[PDB]
From a paper:
The transient receptor potential channel [name] is a master regulator of the organismal balance of divalent cations that plays an essential role in embryonic development, immune responses, cell mobility, proliferation, and differentiation. [name] represents a master regulator of the cellular balance of divalent cations and mediates uptake of Zn2+, Mg2+ and Ca2+, which is required for the normal prenatal development and healthy adulthood. The [name] structure represents a tetramer assembled of four identical subunits, with the overall architecture reminiscent of other TRPM channels. Each [name] subunit consists of an intracellular N-terminal domain (NTD, residues 1–789), transmembrane domain (TMD, 839–1146), and cytosolic C-terminal domain (CTD, 1157–1230).
Author numbering:
A (entry chain A): 3 to 540, 614 to 797, 839 to 1147, 1157 to 1230
B (entry chain D): 839 to 1006
C (entry chain D): 1099 to 1147, 1157 to 1189
D (entry chain B): 1190 to 1230
The structure:
């Protein structure tokens, strides 16, 4: 039946008839009134049962004999006469009301339903997730009433306490009592608002009026919400979400749940509270207006299986408030003022008519309650003690169970209540044995609760002695808490795509993940030789810089709020932020690449750009203090980060606001010059000094002091250590600015010669010009091979895919390959000697050169793209050409729309021919450029140049061409121009940042090239080869300076953090909504005082009364 | 996932029916371009028959998607379909083709010169103008792409609303 | 015109995908020269003798549950921001 | 002097002396009422 409720759980049927209150009366013949009102000790009529076996008494007489000795009549028991016979009330209520529906669920069941299946109904069947708190509400069972202040404050606190701990409120489920007032408070407070306070009412079935409506299988239970006061029995309060209804087998009887309700709570405080945490779910109990049984059940908690605290509030009603009285006037041991029982027994007889000897018993038991007042909690709502019932509720479960302060934190940690922990658990004079703090931190980190981590870090914890290898290895490999599906995929690939089905994660295999995420030739400290051994082998396992290893964790597991927090702590702030940007950015790519079950990449994209801006804002700060030191920060080896550099890391992430920041730019300019002081020299003096070397010794060079911030080579460092002449030439020819204008001049002289060769005739053998051309291209090629093999990546297949990912490197490959095809044909041809251009192998060779040369003119746009003013226009041209594809397809369609009808009308006797392919494109294309072929349009006109193709239909071709040019020349060309106009505006908006970012790869290229240009470069290769066969820039800082840099780090690391808060406090509209927050305490307190001012003035005249 | 079910999954996907009609339509224009550019003898060539077959069945295809439309009133199945630019153009392109075929085919061939019989010429010249309809129908295939379609929308709005500048 | 269309071009393209895609959900699987066989077979079928989301009741039920849950969460939200 | 948002942040400056002094008076109003019953004690 797929209805586990129907199957395992069951109802109760009165299957026997025992006349109750059988008092024969009106309407003289017996049977009629013996058939009118003969109730049973079950509670129903014999005619209201009928029950397929109780109908057998409607017809004859009550299911028994006649008189049927009254020694035997009394003997009902649901144990004896009641058959179970599955439930018929497992529907769902649709409580009608406000602009919503207050939907809720229910079930019928017996008072002896097992405590485990009722759990297997709440959690398994109803999907309801196990709580971290229960609020067992035990107050008034009649329609009690309260005043406005308590109506709001008590409401918020009870609600909020359930919000924080995801609690399960428990009531009777009946809107005569607590449930009415419990449920109400949820209504106004908007607890529903993107939120649920799980709320349950254990009621009995028989009473709830319109129970017969709820009868039936799974249905939208049309509970009618009639507030008709004729139905005393009850109206189910329409806010409680769930209604377990004890079908004990009685109707009109009461108290079917009193044990079950408790047993459910007993087997709610008997399961774990999030397995990382080991504790039973704590259970508070509250008291509203309340009766003499409501105080009685307080004695069923204080002296009960694991002691259940009590949160009697102050000011509610008769019970909840009176228990404050006996609390207040009586000592910690419940020591009464001896005239208490001589004047409280008036209070009982004042509040109740419970009696006198009865009342004596009440206070006596009520002190038997108050024998232990370390465990109850009077919420003094007047005088504002705990300032919401909440803080008293939660505190009440952290005091009176002889629990340890670790056992007190660990619960607060589970609840998301730091405020409870900092204010109560972290109280003056506390014990905290040895690793309690440490065990909480392994719990707080895996559970992703920064606010407790933050607190613990302030309250004695140190990450230095707490990051051991088993521990942090644990902290990686936990699916408890916010879990990443991506890391398990990342470990898959690096582990050959082979998982042991269990596969505990090591620190080692993670190191290969980072080396894949950071890319290039990064080497994590988890894959090194020393670490890899001591790991297997395993005091020394305390990780010299732990806050570096946790920042990796928080980012590999998408725990941003932990990452961003931990980043604040420790040192190497700017570096950690540029790694994080790289880690997230790569995972944000591998999501979009792997494209599996995984998702959530734009979330990672945002996380990278979050840390990216942090590194930029630290650069700003550090640069506004000392420009020179900031440059040194961009270039010191890190040594915890694979001996990399903060700049190098930011280029890997393509983090442009950092590379386009004026600090890097001023440094990029200083590496461009080398030891040349170009603020004093000029680029025309560099060109002159290349062509006239003696001017090299006339230029203004630099010292060591104004070169100390610049990353230098081993040589450029050393040659300055030990300003003579030979060192003045070494400074010039090794500067990147010189290697540019020395390759540029050779390249321009290359094109001048190569232009001369294609324009001047070729005899059999090459001329000196053509040999010098071939020499350039040959060595230029070797130069390009080297800068692939000597790239930065390590995998040759990735050294390759990056280099071929640039336009001008692809073009050079084609230009170099196409040249030697041409040389091979030009040179390997058998010369004719009657005419050069009769041998078609020689011609093909020459014609490849004359097209080859176009590649080499266009390579000059790459030299021009170096200039700040020209480069934006080279970017445009590429974006224009790349993205105009679809306009040009339309243009080619419009073209054939015209070219095919024209050729068909004008040339109607054409066999198939290759000319037909030319003649449908040729003239229509030159029209695009405004050539209308004026004397060819009308071919039958007297001034025609085509008088012979006059014939039938040819008069159609002017009309065709008139339409064509309007569409082509006016619409389509200016649509393309309109596109290009928007490209222009887009590029100019971004052109300067992109130019600044591309200076890096540019300048670093001309820091690695040889000092000789491509014809003479071969000597530099030779010398730089037989060196290696026989046998880059680093900021060299002495320890005295290396020290002060770290001092300049921390000082600027510091001043940044302080600043952000200070500006952020001020705000603009923040301040206005901080005002509005303050508009309440005024209005409340202008009503506080304004409430008393009427209380003041009544006094004054009463004192003069 | 057996074999016959793997073919049923492919040829019944909309992406396949697009790139299968698109390739036939492009092969249609390649042939129909070949027919107008190459001379016509008395009877059609295999190329021209394959052209006529396309256009004939292409028409029946358009009849069906009117009668098998979503509306119920035939007079509203009609006014909606003719409310699209390329369905109006196809109607003209289909009607104008068979006027041309009827003249091209129903003409009395001359045998001294094809282009002396003016009924044959009118037929050929309708085809050579008819073909413009079929190049322009390709803008509807291109309008499927996110990048090209905005430029087809422009051209229509440009042409529709430039009336008064062109009168001046 | 250019600037006007580009401001609205992406919404209109997205709206026109519907009639486009639904067209090529109803067409025959054979293209217009060979389509005649598809007409013939799809005619003598009718002479002799569209897309629906088929949900089993177990799933059809949970959809209505996904309705109301999201129907609910919407109404609560609007007020709270407002 | 007049300003536009200046005035709003001159208000916010004044939101404190009110809140302090609404707590000044509001501190005493509890000190007042305890008196009255203590004078009638
Ligand atoms: C990752 C790297 C990035 C950078 C890219 C770098 C890679 C660049 C890659 C470049 C590849 C270039 C390929 C050239 C192929 C030539 C084909 C050809 O047409 O041959 C012709 C000559 O063939 C001969 O062998 C005779 C000519 C002398 C050799 C000159 C070509 C080799 C130079 C190579 C220098 C390599 C340069 C690179 C050096 C490093 C064949 O025709 P024929 O014999 O004339 O015809 C005879 C007919 N007849 C008898 C009727 C007359
Ligand atoms: C605005 C200025 C225009 C005035 C407006 C009024 C329209 C005036 C039009 C009037 C139509 C009558 C003129 C043609 C009569 C035959 C004469 C002739 O020699 O024709 C020649 C061609 O042309 C033709 O054979 C037909 C041309 C029709 C074009 C008109 C289209 C509608 C114009 C808009 C309608 C207007 C209203 C709507 C506007 C919104 C014959 O051939 P051929 O080219 O010499 O050469 C071929 C070979 N041959 C030499 C061996 C023969
Ligand atoms: C809601 C719908 C949306 C979709 C739109 C769909 C609707 C599309 C509607 C299309 C309507 C097309 C109308 C064609 C009229 C031809 C007129 C003509 O010029 O005839 C000529 C031939 O006439 C003949 O009868 C002989 C040629 C054979 C018949 C070919 C045309 C019929 C094909 C129809 C296929 C219909 C296709 C549609 C099928 C579904 C008359 O001239 P002649 O005899 O050559 O001259 C003799 C002179 N001489 C003796 C001196 C030489
Ligand atoms: C690779 C590009 C780099 C930039 C440009 C480099 C070169 C710039 C330098 C000069 C450009 C011009 C070259 C000389 C042309 C000589 C002309 C000739 O054929 O014979 C002549 C003399 O010839 C000699 O005296 C032979 C010279 C030996 C080779 C010199 C190589 C030096 C450059 C090695 C490279 C390293 C240096 C650069 C390092 C940065 C006589 O003249 P002609 O014949 O009556 O006149 C020619 C006209 N004709 C064709 C119609 C007949
Ligand atoms: C002797 C003379 C005889 C020989 C003459 C030979 C003729 C000359 C032949 C060719 C021109 C010479 C240069 C090659 C073209 C540039 C490649 C390119 O775009 O690279 C770039 C992208 O790369 C890609 O996107 C890869 C796929 C290519 C894209 C499609 C266009 C090019 C294909 C061929 C179409 C034309 C057919 C030509 C091919 C047969 C890498 O550069 P980037 O800086 O990263 O910018 C890219 C940015 N983007 C990816 C976002 C867009
Ligand atoms: C990637 C590498 C690609 C290319 C590799 C190498 C390919 C090797 C290619 C060619 C080598 C073949 C040598 C000759 C073969 C026999 C023919 C012969 O000798 O003569 C014939 C030559 O006929 C021709 O067509 C010559 C031109 C062919 C080359 C076309 C360009 C290819 C490169 C494209 C650029 C690629 C750029 C790619 C860049 C990435 C005729 O000449 P004849 O004998 O004087 O005439 C006799 C007849 N007569 C009596 C009427 C006069
Ligand atoms: C034989 C004729 C050859 C000359 C051509 C004459 C025509 C006019 C030519 C060129 C004007 C540009 C030259 C002066 C630029 C100096 C400043 C500059 O822009 O610096 C840039 C570098 O320099 C470049 O990027 C310039 C590129 C040089 C190659 C030119 C090839 C194209 C011209 C070939 C002819 C093709 C057209 C057809 C005409 C025949 C920026 O670098 P930087 O490190 O920032 O610079 C210093 C630091 N600072 C600027 C920050 C302070
Ligand atoms: C002899 C004849 C005369 C010679 C002409 C003169 C030589 C030609 C002149 C200029 C050549 C192009 C300059 C490149 C500038 C750099 C661009 C670049 O780096 O990336 C661009 C791609 O790059 C491309 O798309 C390359 C262009 C394709 C090949 C050019 C064909 C030219 C003819 C075709 C026209 C004919 C069609 C109709 C003809 C019937 C970037 O594009 P993006 O993706 O939008 O941006 C990403 C940014 N990124 C750079 C960071 C990656
Ligand atoms: C409807 C459009 C759809 C797309 C394209 C479809 C067709 C693409 C297929 C091919 C394109 C070319 C067509 C054949 C041309 C033959 C040439 C000829 O006249 O005789 C020849 C052989 O001819 C035969 O053997 C007759 C073939 C019978 C008809 C075949 C129909 C198949 C397509 C049915 C449709 C369903 C398939 C597609 C389903 C998606 C010999 O050649 P020739 O005569 O020496 O040279 C001709 C040039 N001339 C005129 C100058 C002489
Ligand atoms: C073999 C060759 C020989 C024969 C050659 C024959 C020549 C070729 C003849 C014509 C071109 C072929 C296609 C027809 C034109 C498109 C119609 C149209 O605009 O439809 C659209 C509107 O429809 C209307 O608005 C209805 C009234 C027409 C508006 C005025 C312009 C067209 C009139 C005729 C003027 C030209 C005179 C030509 C007519 C005699 C429906 O499409 P839509 O997607 O809803 O877009 C509309 C949006 N709008 C309404 C807001 C704007
Ligand atoms: C909606 C339906 C519209 C059309 C329906 C069908 C209309 C039926 C139309 C024509 C059928 C008429 C058949 C021939 C009649 C007698 C004349 C004759 O035989 O020869 C004459 C033909 O003279 C011409 O002008 C022929 C061309 C007329 C058609 C013009 C296009 C109409 C369609 C527009 C497109 C519509 C697109 C609309 C799409 C929505 C002369 O030729 P000859 O005999 O060789 O010469 C003898 C003289 N000689 C000795 C000097 C050589
Ligand atoms: C052989 C000759 C060469 C062939 C040329 C190439 C073929 C021709 C090329 C392009 C053709 C048009 C592309 C249509 C694109 C779709 C547009 C569309 O759907 O609706 C548009 C209407 O549509 C029109 O107005 C249609 C254009 C009128 C007919 C074209 C005449 C061309 C010549 C005239 C010039 C000559 C004048 C002067 C001459 C002396 C929408 O317009 P809207 O109301 O603003 O927008 C509503 C939006 N809606 C779509 C949702 C409804």
């Amino acid at each position: 039946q797929k209805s586990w409720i129907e199957s395992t759980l069951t109802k109760r049927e009165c299957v026997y008839i025992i006349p109750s209150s059988k008092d024969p009366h009106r309407c003289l013949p017996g049977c009629q009134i013996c058939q009118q009102l003969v109730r049973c000790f079950c509670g129903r009529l014999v005619k209201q049962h009928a029950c397929f076996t109780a109908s057998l008494a409607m017809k004859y007489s009550d299911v028994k004999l006649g008189e049927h000795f009254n020694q035997a009549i009394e003997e009902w028991s649901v144990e004896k006469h009641t058959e179970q016979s599955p439930t018929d009330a497992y529907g769902v209520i649709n409580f009608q009301g406000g602009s919503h529906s207050y939907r809720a669920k229910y079930v019928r069941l017996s008072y002896d339903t097992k405590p485990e299946i009722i759990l297997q109904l709440l959690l398994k069947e109803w999907q309801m997730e196990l709580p971290k708190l229960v609020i067992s509400v035990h107050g008034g069972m009649q329609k009690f009433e309260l005043h406005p202040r308590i109506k709001q404050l008590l409401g918020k606190g009870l609600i909020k306490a359930a919000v924080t701990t995801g609690a399960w409120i428990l009531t009777g489920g009946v809107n005569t009592g607590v449930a009415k007032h419990v449920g109400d408070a949820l209504k106004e407070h908007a607890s529903r608002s993107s939120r649920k306070i799980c709320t349950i009412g254990i009621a009995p079935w028989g009473v709830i009026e319109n129970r017969n409506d709820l009868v039936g299988r799974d249905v939208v239970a049309p509970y009618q919400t009639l507030l008709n006061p004729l139905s005393k029995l009850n109206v189910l309060n329409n806010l409680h979400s769930h209604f377990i209804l004890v079908d004990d087998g009685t109707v009109g009887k009461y108290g079917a749940e009193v044990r079950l309700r408790r047993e459910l709570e007993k087997t709610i405080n008997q399961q774990r509270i999030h397995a990382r945490i080991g504790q039973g779910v704590p259970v508070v109990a509250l008291i509203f207006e309340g009766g003499p049984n409501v105080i009685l059940t307080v004695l069923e908690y204080l002296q009960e299986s694991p002691p259940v605290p009590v949160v009697v509030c102050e000011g509610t009603g008769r019970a909840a408030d009176l228990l404050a009285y006996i609390h207040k006037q009586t000592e910690e041991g419940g020591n009464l003022p001896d005239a208490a029982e001589p004047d409280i027994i008036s209070t009982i007889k004042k509040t109740f008519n419970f009696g006198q000897s009865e009342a004596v018993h009440l206070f006596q038991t009520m002190m038997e309650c108050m024998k232990k007042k370390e465990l109850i909690t009077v919420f003094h709502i007047g005088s504002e003690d705990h300032q919401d019932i909440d803080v008293a509720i939660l505190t009440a479960l952290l005091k009176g169970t002889n629990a340890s302060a670790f056992d007190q934190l660990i619960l607060t940690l589970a609840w998301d209540r730091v405020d409870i922990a900092k204010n109560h658990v972290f109280v003056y004079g506390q014990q905290w044995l040895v690793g309690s703090l440490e065990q909480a931190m392994l719990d707080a980190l895996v559970m992703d609760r920064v606010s407790f981590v933050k607190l613990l870090i302030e309250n004695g914890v140190s990450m230095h002695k707490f990051l051991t290898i088993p521990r942090l290895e644990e902290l990686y490999n936990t699916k408890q808490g916010p879990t990443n599906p991506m890391l398990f995929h990342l470990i898959r690939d690096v582990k050959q795509g082979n998982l042991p089905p269990g596969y505990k994660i090591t620190l080692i295999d993670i190191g290969l993940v980072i080396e894949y995420l950071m890319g290039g030739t990064y080497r994590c400290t988890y894959t090194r030789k020393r670490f890899r051994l001591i790991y297997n082998s395993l005091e020394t396992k305390r990780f010299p810089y732990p806050l570096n290893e946790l920042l990796i964790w928080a980012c590999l597991m998408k725990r941003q709020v932990m990452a961003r927090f931990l980043w604040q702590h420790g040192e190497e702030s700017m570096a950690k932020a540029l790694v994080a940007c790289k880690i997230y950015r790569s995972m944000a790519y591998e999501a979009k690449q792997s494209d599996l079950v995984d998702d959530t990449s734009e979330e990672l994209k945002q996380y990278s750009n979050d840390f990216g801006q942090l590194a930029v804002e630290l650069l700003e700060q550090s640069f506004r203090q000392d420009e020179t030191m900031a440059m040194k920060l961009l270039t010191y080896e890190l040594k915890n980060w694979s001996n990399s550099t903060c700049l190098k890391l930011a280029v890997s992430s393509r983090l442009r606001p950092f590379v386009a920041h004026t600090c890097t730019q001023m440094l990029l300019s200083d590496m461009w010059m080398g030891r040349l002081n170009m603020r004093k020299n000029s680029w025309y003096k560099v060109i002159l000094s290349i062509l006239v070397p003696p001017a090299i010794l006339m230029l203004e060079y630099k010292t060591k002091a104004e070169m100390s911030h610049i990353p230098q080579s081993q040589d450029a460092h050393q040659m300055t250590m030990e300003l003579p002449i030979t060192r003045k030439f070494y400074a010039f020819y090794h500067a990147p600015i010189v290697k540019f204008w020395f390759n540029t001049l050779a390249y321009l002289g290359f094109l001048m010669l190569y232009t001369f060769v294609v324009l001047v005739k070729m005899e059999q053998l090459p001329s000196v010009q053509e040999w010098i051309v071939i020499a350039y291209i040959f060595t230029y090629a070797i130069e390009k091979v080297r800068e692939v093999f000597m790239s930065e990546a390590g995998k040759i297949s990735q050294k390759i895919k990056v280099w071929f990912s640039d336009y001008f490197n692809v073009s050079d490959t084609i230009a170099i390959i196409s040249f030697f095809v041409g040389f091979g044909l030009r040179f390997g041809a058998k010369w004719n000697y009657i005419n050069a251009y009769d041998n078609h192998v020689f011609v093909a060779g020459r014609l490849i050169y004359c097209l080859n040369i176009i590649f080499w003119y266009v390579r000059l746009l790459d030299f021009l793209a170096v200039n700040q003013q020209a480069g934006p226009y080279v970017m445009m041209i590429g974006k224009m050409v790349a993205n105009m594809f679809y306009i040009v397809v339309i243009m080619a369609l419009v073209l054939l729309s015209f070219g095919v009808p024209r050729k068909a009308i004008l040339y109607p006797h054409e066999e198939p021919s290759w000319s037909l392919a030319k003649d449908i494109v040729f003239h229509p294309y030159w029209m695009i450029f405004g050539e209308v072929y004026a004397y060819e349009i009308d071919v039958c006109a007297n001034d025609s140049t085509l008088p012979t193709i006059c014939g039938p239909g040819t008069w159609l071709t002017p009309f065709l061409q008139a339409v064509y040019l309007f569409v082509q020349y006016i619409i389509m060309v200016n649509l393309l121009i309109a596109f290009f106009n928007q490209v222009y505006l887009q590029v100019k908006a971004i052109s300067n940042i992109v130019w600044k970012y591309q200076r890096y790869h540019f300048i670093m290229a001309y820091h690695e090239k040889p000092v000789l240009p491509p014809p003479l470069i071969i000597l530099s290769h030779i010398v730089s080869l037989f060196c290696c066969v026989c046998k880059g820039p680093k900021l060299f800082l002495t320890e005295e300076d290396q020290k002060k840099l770290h001092d300049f780090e921390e000082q600027c690391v510091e001043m940044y953090f302080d600043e952000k808060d200070d500006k952020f406090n001020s705000g603009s509209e923040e301040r206005i909504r901080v005002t509005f927050e303050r508009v309440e305490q005024m209005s409340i307190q202008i009503k506080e005082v304004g409430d008393r001012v009427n209380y003041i003035k009544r006094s004054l005249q009463s004192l003069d009364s």
